[PDB]
Structures are given as C-alpha cells and as structure tokens.
C-alpha cells in the first residue's frame, strides 16, 4: 500500500494534486513495473469541493449546482487513467468513493461519476441502521464488467449463475417481506417462507461480514451455495441444470 493522505485542513490545492500523485504512482507501478494496481480514491466529493475552490480562485463563474462546468472533464481525467493496456502485464483498477450529498443520486458529482465509471456499490443507510456490516445494498448496485471479471479460469464455473440466482432470490425476498407486511405470516405460502428465510440468512451470512473477515471468492461462492440450498433445485430457475447437478449437492 502506498498511502497519500490529504487532511481536511490541508491545502485544497494539495487536495487537487493528491489524486494525480496517486494515479501517477499507479501508472508507474502498473504500466512500467507491471503489477496490478488497485487505486482507492476516498472522498471525490471533497476533491470536487477543492475543485470548486480552485475555480472560484480562478474567478470562473459557478456552473451546474455551483460546481465547475468542466468537472466532468476533470473527473474523466482522474478516472480514465485506468485499465489494461496492450503489451503490458499490469493494470489499474479504480474504486472512487463518493459521499452522495443529501443522498441525491442526481447530484453532479455522483452523476458524472456514473457517466465516467462502470458501476456503483451502494452503501445503504437502512442496512447501516440495522447494523449490518458491510452495509452494501446489492439491488441498486451494479458492476458492468462482472461478466468479464467472473467465469472459468478467472473465479469459477458457477460464479455467474450463483450471482444471478442470489440477486433474484434477494429481490423476491424483499417482495415477499413487503407482501407479508400486508397479508400476514399465515397467508404466506411455503415458497414465501423459504424466500423470507433466504433473505434473512443472506443478510446475516453473505452481506454481514465483519471488518476483519477476509473471504476468498471461493468462500463467498460456498456461502452463496449454502444460501441457495435453502430452496430445492426446481425454484433455482436462473442456475442451469448443468451447474445445479454439480454444485447443488452436499
């Protein structure tokens, strides 16, 4: 880990040049030293505040929502310094972290970040209040290149099917909870009870991790299969029978 810290009370111009320092080091290590670099940029909202300050100092008029008009170009300059390249064995994965102001996904910073990046991992206030760690919401979250990230020889044969079935069962479990809120526990069917059970155990075993619990992706998939074995083979409609016959048993 190479750690660049820009404290809130440090110069905002230093805040501006911090991500460029980090990504220059990442480019050196990845495209010259040929090692896969993960760049974790924390508080792009604070970076945007520094950018706003520098624009005002330049005496440029505020743009949308008081932010610079070129903030999209600046955020693109930061983010797009990432990815694999031809003829080099290194790469730069990026995980910018944003503090959505007022929890408004339409705010310029998260909006342009979604325009430039390739996914989002949502941290849910509801889960945080329910005291689940990590409070990552998997329904609104997305990773466009999960299909490239997973598969045989990269993670495992059944990663995509397990992930899809887990998402489907989780959404159905939330729906069944909403329905139970109206009809009552008795009116629910056996499949509804199974879905509620899977929802509970998925938020208690899959999501709920603990700060210092390092799960290899194989452990993650084993937990996912433990949760999927709540249901019989038939209700797992999103897992091909070829994969169910191999990983469902036990």
């Amino acid at each position: 880990v190479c750690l660049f810290l820009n404290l809130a009370n440090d110069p905002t111009i230093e805040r501006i040049i911090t991500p460029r320092l980090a990504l220059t080091t990442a480019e050196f290590l990845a495209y010259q030293c040929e090692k896969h670099v993960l760049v974790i940029l924390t508080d792009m909202s604070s970076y945007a505040e520094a950018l706003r300050e520098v624009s005002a100092a330049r005496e440029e008029v505020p743009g949308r929502r008081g932010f610079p008009g070129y903030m999209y170009t600046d955020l693109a300059t930061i983010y797009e310094r990432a990815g694999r390249v031809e003829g080099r064995n290194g790469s730069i994965t990026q995980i910018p972290i944003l503090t959505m102001p007022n929890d408004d996904i339409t705010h310029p910073i998260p909006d342009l970040t979604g325009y430039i990046t390739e996914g989002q991992i949502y941290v849910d206030r509801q889960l945080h209040n329910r005291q689940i760690y990590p409070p990552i919401n998997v329904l609104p979250s997305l990773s466009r290149l999960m299909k490239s990230a997973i598969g045989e020889g990269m993670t495992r044969k059944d990663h995509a099917d397990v992930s899809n079935q887990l998402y489907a069962c989780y959404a159905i479990g939330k729906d069944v909870q909403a329905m139970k809120a109206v009809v009552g526990e008795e009116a629910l069917t056996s499949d509804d009870l199974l879905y509620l059970e899977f929802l509970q155990k998925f938020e208690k075993n899959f999501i709920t991790q603990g700060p210092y619990e390092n799960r290899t992706v194989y452990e993650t998939l084993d937990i996912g299969w433990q949760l999927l074995r709540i249901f019989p083979k038939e209700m797992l409609k999103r897992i091909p029978q070829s994969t169910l016959s191999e990983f469902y048993p036990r």
Binding site: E59, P62, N102, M179, A181, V182, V183, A187
Partner: protein, 214 residues
C-alpha cells in the same frame, strides 16, 4: 390541482421526492393487498360455482327422499309445518381474515331440541328418518354456501375500495407530485440562471473597472 403549491427550494424538492417515494410504496402495498383479495375472491367464486353444482344434486336427492317419504308416511307436510316449537339447528357467526379485511362466515351448530321424533312412528319411520338425514346434509351444504357468499360479497366490496384507492393514488396523487417536482426543478434552474447572469454582469463590470484603472 396540478401542483401541491410548495414553494420551489431544495428542501421542497427533497420533501416532494420523499412524498413521491412514499406514495409509490403505498400504491405498491395496496396493489399487493388488492391482488391477495382478488385471488381469494376468485377462489371463493370457483368454490361458489362448485357448491352450486353440488347443490344441484344434493337438493334433488333431498326432494326425492321427500317424495318417497310421501309414499309411505302420507301427507305429513301439515304436521311438520304445524309442530315447529323450537329450532333444532341454529347458526353462530364467525370471523375470517383475508389481508386486513374481515370476512363474515357461519357455523353449523345443533341445539338438540328435536321436535319431529315419533313423526312417522307407525307408518313413516325409515323414510322420514332418511329424509331428515338428507335435509340435514342439504343444510350442511347450504350453510357452507352462505358463508362463501357472505365472504364473496365482503371481498367484492373490499376489492372495489382498494382498487379505487390504488387508482386514486396513481392517477391523482402521483401525477400531482411529479408535476410539482418538475416545476421545482424548473424554478431552481431559473434561480441558477439568474444568479449566473448576476455574477457574469459583476465580472464584466469588474473587468471594465480594471480597464478604467489601467
């Protein structure tokens, strides 16, 4: 009317977004309640059709048992009608719950105060006893039918009310909030435009003043 008439502001926008989400969630929950009520309503409708078909046979059997009774016992209808005394079979109200809607139903209950014993002591006998049993069976069928029809009517009314609620929401309230949010966004854009114009004017004046000093 078209708008809720909340003054444009970021606080107003947040309030209206929260209200829109709440209205959508309530609409979804009421739609689920309507779906449950409609499912139970159609189940009871099919049960009613089946029970009517089965009555088509039970009532016929009871009537033919009566016709056979009149073969041996003779004209016992007048005796049966005259000696009423006290009902041997009464009904007890019961409650049934579907979603939040309570469905009235009936209970088949006996009193034991028989009053037609010995009615065919000399001639009727077996035929009248069989007729009594057949009409007790018919009453057992028709009490279930009555409970089904009462639940059916209650479910019909509740379904209509809940569908009216859902339609009212999604045709009046949600459009109102959506229009309010659109207007608020437009007005905030207008505020941003006015502030931009003022700042640009000030910058132009500052440039002119700098030139004047130079």
């Amino acid at each position: 009317k078209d708008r809720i008439e909340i003054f444009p502001s970021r606080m107003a926008q947040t309030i209206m977004k929260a209200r829109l989400k709440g209205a959508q969630t309530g609409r979804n929950l009421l739609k689920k309640k309507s779906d449950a009520l409609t499912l139970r309503f159609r189940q009871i409708l099919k049960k009613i059709i089946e029970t009517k078909m089965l009555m088509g046979e039970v009532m016929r059997e009871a009537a033919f048992s009566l016709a056979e009774a009149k073969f041996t016992a003779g004209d016992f209808s007048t005796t049966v009608i005259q000696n009423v005394n006290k009902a041997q079979v009464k009904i007890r109200a019961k409650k049934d719950n579907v979603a939040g809607v309570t469905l009235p139903v009936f209970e088949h209950y006996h009193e034991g105060t028989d009053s037609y014993e010995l009615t065919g002591l000399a001639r009727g006998g077996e035929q009248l006893a069989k007729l009594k049993r057949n009409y007790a069976k018919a009453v057992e069928l028709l009490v279930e039918l009555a409970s089904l029809q009462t639940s059916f009517v209650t479910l019909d009314e509740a379904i209509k009310i809940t569908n009216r609620r859902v339609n009212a929401i999604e045709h009046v309230i949600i459009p109102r909030i959506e229009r309010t949010l659109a207007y608020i966004i437009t007005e905030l854009d207008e505020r941003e435009r006015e502030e931009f114009y003022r700042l640009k004017k000030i910058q132009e004046k500052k440039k002119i003043i700098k030139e004047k000093s130079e």
